[PDB]
Scaffold this active site. Sequence first.
Site, mmCIF file in Angstrom:
data_model
loop_
_atom_site.group_PDB
_atom_site.id
_atom_site.type_symbol
_atom_site.label_atom_id
_atom_site.label_comp_id
_atom_site.label_asym_id
_atom_site.label_seq_id
_atom_site.Cartn_x
_atom_site.Cartn_y
_atom_site.Cartn_z
ATOM 1 N NE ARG C 13 -3.462 -0.405 2.841
ATOM 2 C CZ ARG C 13 -4.652 0.087 2.496
ATOM 3 N NH1 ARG C 13 -5.342 -0.440 1.489
ATOM 4 N NH2 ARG C 13 -5.145 1.122 3.155
ATOM 5 C CB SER C 135 14.440 14.834 6.538
ATOM 6 O OG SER C 135 14.161 14.072 5.381
ATOM 7 C CG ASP C 141 -5.808 10.716 9.601
ATOM 8 O OD1 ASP C 141 -6.480 11.447 8.840
ATOM 9 O OD2 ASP C 141 -6.204 9.568 9.945
ATOM 10 C CE1 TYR C 154 -4.783 5.863 12.659
ATOM 11 C CE2 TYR C 154 -6.617 7.454 12.537
ATOM 12 C CZ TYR C 154 -5.451 6.914 12.007
ATOM 13 O OH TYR C 154 -4.938 7.437 10.845
ATOM 14 C CG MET C 156 -6.500 9.867 22.243
ATOM 15 S SD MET C 156 -7.028 8.749 23.539
ATOM 16 C CE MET C 156 -5.764 8.977 24.749
HETATM 17 N N1 LIG Z 1 -4.882 4.857 3.638
HETATM 18 C C1 LIG Z 1 -5.393 6.045 3.928
HETATM 19 O O1 LIG Z 1 -6.474 6.531 3.216
HETATM 20 C C2 LIG Z 1 -4.827 6.898 5.032
HETATM 21 C C3 LIG Z 1 -5.541 7.981 5.525
HETATM 22 C C4 LIG Z 1 -5.021 8.772 6.553
HETATM 23 C C5 LIG Z 1 -3.763 8.475 7.083
HETATM 24 N N2 LIG Z 1 -3.064 7.404 6.589
HETATM 25 C C6 LIG Z 1 -1.737 7.074 7.156
HETATM 26 O O2 LIG Z 1 -0.828 6.750 6.112
HETATM 27 C C7 LIG Z 1 0.030 5.672 6.509
HETATM 28 C C8 LIG Z 1 -0.123 4.521 5.514
HETATM 29 O O3 LIG Z 1 -1.498 4.168 5.366
HETATM 30 P P1 LIG Z 1 -1.945 2.671 4.871
HETATM 31 O O4 LIG Z 1 -3.419 2.654 4.670
HETATM 32 O O5 LIG Z 1 -0.989 2.296 3.801
HETATM 33 O O6 LIG Z 1 -1.565 1.854 6.189
HETATM 34 P P2 LIG Z 1 -2.002 0.393 6.632
HETATM 35 O O7 LIG Z 1 -2.116 -0.369 5.367
HETATM 36 O O8 LIG Z 1 -3.215 0.423 7.459
HETATM 37 O O9 LIG Z 1 -0.742 -0.071 7.511
HETATM 38 C C9 LIG Z 1 0.566 -0.056 6.976
HETATM 39 C C10 LIG Z 1 1.417 -1.132 7.650
HETATM 40 O O10 LIG Z 1 1.532 -0.885 9.037
HETATM 41 C C11 LIG Z 1 2.070 -2.045 9.602
HETATM 42 N N3 LIG Z 1 1.611 -2.329 10.977
HETATM 43 C C12 LIG Z 1 0.317 -2.388 11.481
HETATM 44 N N4 LIG Z 1 0.378 -2.761 12.789
HETATM 45 C C13 LIG Z 1 1.698 -2.950 13.119
HETATM 46 C C14 LIG Z 1 2.368 -3.364 14.268
HETATM 47 N N5 LIG Z 1 1.753 -3.654 15.423
HETATM 48 N N6 LIG Z 1 3.751 -3.456 14.227
HETATM 49 C C15 LIG Z 1 4.486 -3.168 13.093
HETATM 50 N N7 LIG Z 1 3.833 -2.802 11.943
HETATM 51 C C16 LIG Z 1 2.469 -2.705 11.963
HETATM 52 C C17 LIG Z 1 1.568 -3.229 8.737
HETATM 53 O O11 LIG Z 1 2.645 -4.031 8.275
HETATM 54 P P3 LIG Z 1 2.535 -5.603 7.961
HETATM 55 O O12 LIG Z 1 1.618 -5.709 6.757
HETATM 56 O O13 LIG Z 1 3.914 -6.055 7.551
HETATM 57 O O14 LIG Z 1 1.990 -6.299 9.183
HETATM 58 C C18 LIG Z 1 0.828 -2.533 7.601
HETATM 59 O O15 LIG Z 1 0.977 -3.137 6.342
HETATM 60 C C19 LIG Z 1 -0.406 5.249 7.903
HETATM 61 O O16 LIG Z 1 0.432 5.885 8.814
HETATM 62 C C20 LIG Z 1 -1.816 5.800 7.998
HETATM 63 O O17 LIG Z 1 -2.295 6.015 9.300
HETATM 64 C C21 LIG Z 1 -3.577 6.626 5.574
HETATM 65 N N1 LIG Z 2 -5.273 5.446 8.795
HETATM 66 C C1 LIG Z 2 -6.388 5.716 8.098
HETATM 67 N N2 LIG Z 2 -6.821 4.976 7.073
HETATM 68 C C2 LIG Z 2 -7.949 5.532 6.610
HETATM 69 C C3 LIG Z 2 -8.825 5.181 5.564
HETATM 70 C C4 LIG Z 2 -9.956 5.968 5.313
HETATM 71 C C5 LIG Z 2 -10.216 7.095 6.100
HETATM 72 C C6 LIG Z 2 -9.342 7.451 7.138
HETATM 73 C C7 LIG Z 2 -8.202 6.671 7.396
HETATM 74 N N3 LIG Z 2 -7.216 6.750 8.305
#
Ligand SMILES: NC(=O)c1ccc[n+]([C@@H]2O[C@H](COP(=O)([O-])OP(=O)(O)OC[C@H]3O[C@@H](n4cnc5c(N)ncnc54)[C@H](OP(=O)(O)O)[C@@H]3O)[C@@H](O)[C@H]2O)c1
Ligand SMILES: Nc1nc2ccccc2[nH]1
Lengths: 250, 248, 248, 249
Positions: C13, C135, C141, C154, C156
């Site tokens: 992702r 960096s 978020d 989350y 927090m």
């Molecule tokens: N996707 C969105 O629309 C969105 C929105 C707002 C913010 N964000 C932020 O952007 C970043 C990436 O988003 P994403 O949707 O790609 O993230 P995600 O798929 O939900 O998580 C990314 C990776 O985090 C690792 N992870 C989860 N729990 C863990 C643990 N206990 N220990 C070590 N690793 C762990 C997992 O690795 P493994 O697969 O190897 O277990 C997972 O593949 C995140 O920080 C997220 O909060 C995303």
């Molecule tokens: N981490 C994370 N993943 C999200 C997916 C949809 C909306 C908000 C989100 N925050």
Amino acid sequence: EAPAAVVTGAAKRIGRAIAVKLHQTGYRVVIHYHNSAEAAVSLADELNKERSNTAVVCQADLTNSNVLPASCEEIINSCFRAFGRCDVLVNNASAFYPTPLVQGKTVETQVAELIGTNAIAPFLLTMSFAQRQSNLSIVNLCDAMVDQPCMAFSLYNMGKHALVGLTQSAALELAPYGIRVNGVAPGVSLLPVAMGEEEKDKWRRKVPLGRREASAEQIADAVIFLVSGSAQYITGSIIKVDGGLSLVHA
Amino acid sequence: EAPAAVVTGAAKRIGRAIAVKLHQTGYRVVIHYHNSAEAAVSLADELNKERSNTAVVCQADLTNSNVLPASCEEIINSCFRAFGRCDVLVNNASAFYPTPLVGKTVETQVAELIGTNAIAPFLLTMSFAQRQNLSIVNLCDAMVDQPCMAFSLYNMGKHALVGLTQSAALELAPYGIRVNGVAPGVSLLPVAMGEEEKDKWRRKVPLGRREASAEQIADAVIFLVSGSAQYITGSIIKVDGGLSLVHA
Amino acid sequence: EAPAAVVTGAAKRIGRAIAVKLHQTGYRVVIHYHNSAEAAVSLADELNKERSNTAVVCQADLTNSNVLPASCEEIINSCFRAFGRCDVLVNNASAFYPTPLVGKTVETQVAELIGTNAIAPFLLTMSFAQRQNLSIVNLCDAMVDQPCMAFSLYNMGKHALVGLTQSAALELAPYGIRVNGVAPGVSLLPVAMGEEEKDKWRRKVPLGRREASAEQIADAVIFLVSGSAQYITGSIIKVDGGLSLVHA
Amino acid sequence: EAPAAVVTGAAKRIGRAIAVKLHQTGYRVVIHYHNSAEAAVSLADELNKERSNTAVVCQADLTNSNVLPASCEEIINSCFRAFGRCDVLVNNASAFYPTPLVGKTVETQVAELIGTNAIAPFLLTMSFAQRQSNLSIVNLCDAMVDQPCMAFSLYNMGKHALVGLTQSAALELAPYGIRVNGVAPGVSLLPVAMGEEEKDKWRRKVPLGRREASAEQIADAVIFLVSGSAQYITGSIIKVDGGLSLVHA
Ligand SMILES: NC(=O)c1ccc[n+]([C@@H]2O[C@H](COP(=O)([O-])OP(=O)(O)OC[C@H]3O[C@@H](n4cnc5c(N)ncnc54)[C@H](OP(=O)(O)O)[C@@H]3O)[C@@H](O)[C@H]2O)c1
Ligand SMILES: Nc1nc2ccccc2[nH]1
Ligand SMILES: NC(=O)c1ccc[n+]([C@@H]2O[C@H](COP(=O)([O-])OP(=O)(O)OC[C@H]3O[C@@H](n4cnc5c(N)ncnc54)[C@H](OP(=O)(O)O)[C@@H]3O)[C@@H](O)[C@H]2O)c1
Ligand SMILES: NC(=O)c1ccc[n+]([C@@H]2O[C@H](COP(=O)([O-])OP(=O)(O)OC[C@H]3O[C@@H](n4cnc5c(N)ncnc54)[C@H](OP(=O)(O)O)[C@@H]3O)[C@@H](O)[C@H]2O)c1
Ligand SMILES: NC(=O)c1ccc[n+]([C@@H]2O[C@H](COP(=O)([O-])OP(=O)(O)OC[C@H]3O[C@@H](n4cnc5c(N)ncnc54)[C@H](OP(=O)(O)O)[C@@H]3O)[C@@H](O)[C@H]2O)c1
Ligand SMILES: Nc1nc2ccccc2[nH]1
Ligand SMILES: Nc1nc2ccccc2[nH]1
């Protein structure tokens, strides 16, 4: 065909570096100026030496008045006249001086200049830009210190605050048209010509990252990113370029 | 001796509630109005019935123009002429209407929306300070970061008002003048608005699925001007029932 | 020679897209993973096929515990081990699920949600700085001020991450280490999310009524780590298509 | 019958000022304390001497641990045990010390700084709402969260997380008519370990009167937020900082 950008207050300092970087990136540029006629014509000359017919000057007062809409319409018109398109607007021009609440310009003149240049002219240029309409965007030059204002700068600070308001309002409303609207917020960059050396060094000593002001080029770098294809999903964001200055407590 | 407050746009709605609550706390009040003369006078008469020589009205257009500084000077001066003091200024009067980016000219809209919401508050602050538990309360808006579609100038005006609140708080603290804001989310809704549209907004509010009464807005102004807020300056208190916390 | 980056949660992702884009820019990469070993090694295989010995994998649970600090030290160490340097840390790994206020224990959820989102970034930041165009980029978020309902832990965690971003930008500036954030709104929707609920979010985005690609998020990370961002620290770039500006 | 309030870390300083003011307003109080037993009992004695059976003490560590949810549940249970109700929760207790990025272990510092400032407030909020008219929670925040003290990352992470909780809980508990708000001091009572010279350095930065907030001044804003004059206020954080946060470097 090369895209075209309008940069206001582009004759000198940060405005000029934005104009130069847009041109380097492949843009044709309208160099808007108010008083700095020699510098603007000189900049257009320099840029036209590099690629002919890629730069023009456009003179306008951005003080608020009943003809400001006409003036703003004309700046955008001048881009279409020169280049047949207008892809990027940079709202850079800015009056910056103190307006103490307690005690030659009249207060209404200070309102017209400080609120007009920092806020109303950007609003009207935004209207005209959108009305004449790819990777279309507007970048507003904001201020990273808006929440920790310079003492006795109420009108200036109100102008910049209104500019943040416009950035968000225009991002939301122009999104349907594919026009992105963002900001760059310098903390301390190229210090005022009239600011004394002791003061300049006082501000420099405050910046966590390298104890120095930003170059005009470091500010422009952020503008370039925001207009680019690498910022295609970014609208409504204001990027601080302040070396951490806004994070330092009193 | 009783303190004195100027409330702008005080004939109706939130302004009226502020003036009434200020009066109930013991303030003499200057009731500023633009077009609502009958309402402003009826309010004055009610408050003067309650306690004689405690309320006056003052008419002024707060649209920006070369005469606005004089108008703002005169509003402040009327509080001194009536009551010999001016302890509180409430910047409440506000124009609010859409100004899309794509009969009023745009510059008249600029004058009205930026004038009422920002320039007039700035001029009144200068005049209030120049004439000096002193404080200013500005009426802001809890929804400034998620603005109404096509309300750029209104939003610019309210953003500018936040700027003024902070700038004046900083600059006037040496004189012991506190400067704060109250930011309503949704309060008193337009008269003519269909109940079904009002209800669309009401249902968005986490706390009670209703809008704020004007009295609830007035309550936060009362706190800010009171002795219980003596260390509070440059603060904007949201009175929004959690509305600004709700994602799209 | 080549600079080196650590990307936490890099197997899939947004994390994968960041690692790929860093590698394409010239970085050697540590691909951290927890559960996704097959995917991490698959990414490394593709990157190393492109340029020999420019990608390694690193396993760690980033849940808070007595051993988390050692785990974080070893992720940083594994970059120095592989590449002799560590220029960039990307804090991307993140647990995401609801925790209603009214079968993991609540303390497990605390450990996972606050641990991945805040404590591990803190510990990795510590190890990164201890071992020293440097960096750190934190994945934040855009919806922190209008959070998902019943996501207090989350939320927090992502709030603490903003706090760390600012704190670390200040304290680490004298070392020449910049600390910044990228705040997605809706990007790649969760794999668990149903199709109609995905479309509901997409419809909310002003710019294009669509989510950000993983690549578009990575683009902002690439900018922040570049020489084009050399004066930028303590900044969090929203990459949200205007979503955070949309009132309820 | 009189409403009841729980104030954490209420033995002295700001927490005491809050429980005193809540008491003067008509609340029965649970004076939570950790190490300050002598001071807590002294306070409950004073308040009980004012009105009999209107104050009890409650000892608990608010450091994060696997038993923290049980401790927090028990603080709330103690209010219902003493008073039959629990109307107000004030999350005041707070650990505050530096944690430089470059003999407490770091995980102890996490447990204390994030535990007291964020996790306990969150668990106390769950228990408060689980146990359930003018109900509210007030979280004691920090007006300097965006201009933090140098080398205070964990403290700062904890106070940021507390903002997150204020907003999250405000949203989630609004349907139950539980308001969740915050009060953010800049400089109020300086640390007892601070010498007079360092105190004055801080005092001189405050635009409004060049002095710290009194404990009463902070309590005033808490009292406002719990009152009927704040019945439409939820998710708000009132800065009580004399303009400190507005002053540039
Ligand atoms: N996707 C969105 O629309 C969105 C929105 C707002 C913010 N964000 C932020 O952007 C970043 C990436 O988003 P994403 O949707 O790609 O993230 P995600 O798929 O939900 O998580 C990314 C990776 O985090 C690792 N992870 C989860 N729990 C863990 C643990 N206990 N220990 C070590 N690793 C762990 C997992 O690795 P493994 O697969 O190897 O277990 C997972 O593949 C995140 O920080 C997220 O909060 C995303
Ligand atoms: N981490 C994370 N993943 C999200 C997916 C949809 C909306 C908000 C989100 N925050
Ligand atoms: N420099 C910094 O440390 C700093 C810090 C925070 C924010 N900013 C913002 O970043 C931007 C660039 O900064 P800067 O220092 O380069 O700006 P600046 O030199 O102070 O002003 C830029 C130009 O604005 C034009 N201008 C002033 N009044 C005008 C008017 N009434 N009508 C039309 N143009 C007018 C002037 O044009 P002419 O010379 O042609 O008359 C001037 O050259 C500004 O928006 C500024 O507010 C800068
Ligand atoms: N109602 C809400 O849901 C809400 C939401 C967010 C923020 N607010 C803010 O809270 C405050 C009070 O709100 P409200 O709805 O009660 O206000 P409002 O009814 O919309 O306006 C208050 C008064 O402003 C005065 N005014 C308008 N244009 C003027 C001008 N050109 N010169 C002088 N005065 C002028 C009018 O006075 P006259 O009638 O005498 O002409 C009007 O009665 C306003 O600042 C508003 O922006 C309200
Ligand atoms: N004072 C200020 O200038 C200032 C500035 C900004 C924010 N604030 C915030 O406002 C609130 C009041 O400040 P303050 O200076 O009065 O607070 P404080 O004296 O530093 O701490 C208040 C109480 O917190 C309790 N506490 C500490 N660690 C604990 C633990 N592990 N478990 C349970 N309780 C623990 C202590 O209880 P025991 O004594 O019973 O052991 C202490 O008496 C705090 O949340 C603070 O962060 C204060
Ligand atoms: N516009 C603007 N804002 C400034 C703040 C500090 C120094 C120079 C500045 N120019
Ligand atoms: N909690 C807390 N925050 C503080 C900020 C400055 C001085 C003392 C403080 N105590």
